[PDB]
Amino acid sequence: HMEQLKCCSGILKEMFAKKHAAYAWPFYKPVDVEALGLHDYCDIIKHPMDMSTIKSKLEAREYRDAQEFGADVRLMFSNCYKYNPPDHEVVAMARKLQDVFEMRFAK
Ligand SMILES: CCNC(=O)c1cc2c(-c3cc(S(C)(=O)=O)ccc3Oc3ccc(F)cc3F)cn(C)c(=O)c2[nH]1
């Protein structure tokens, strides 16, 4: 349970790595709804999630185990698949970052 969270820090560190930056950047920080003019985001997405928030919750020991950490990572991608049209570029970027996550998470 607790032994798994040090692997979670390594996964998140890998997701913030420069080799993933071309597709990972939209997930580093919360969606800036004001800068993008997305007035309905908070009405559709009840639980916003991004990599910086997950890092804060992980350092605050808010995840009991890897499953709790993985649920927030998957909430981040699901928020993206739910809010956006399926053909939007951010959805293709979310799929590439999710492959990086799923690979390290399974291993
Ligand atoms: C159809 C309505 N949807 C959106 O406009 C929308 C935007 C985002 C962003 C996002 C956030 C920022 S920021 C750092 O300024 O907060 C800047 C750019 C962003 O996305 C892109 C915008 C245009 C592109 F062509 C390619 C993008 F990647 C992140 N995520 C997780 C989303 O789900 C999302 N949806």
Element holding 68 (H helix, E strand): helix 66-83
Q: Compute, in angstroms, the gap from residue 3 CA to the centroid of ligand 1.
A: 35
Q: Which ligand 1 atom is the nearest neighbour of the CA of 89?
A: 26
Show me where the domains of the chain are located: 1-107
Q: What is the resolution of this structure in A?
A: 2.1
Solved how? X-ray
| Cα separation, 22 vs 97, whole angstroms | 10
Indicate the SS3 state at residue 100.
helix
CATH architecture for the domain at 1-107:
Up-down Bundle (1.20)
Closest CA to 91 of 74, 73, 78: 78
Residue 10 exposure: Cα atoms within 13 Å on the Cβ side = 10
**Ligand 1 pocket check for 75: Cβ under 6 Å:** no
Q: Which ligand 1 atom is the nearest neighbour of the CA of 76?
A: 31
| Mutation probe of ligand 1 site: the residue of 23, 90, 93, 96 with most atoms within 8 A of C-beta | 90
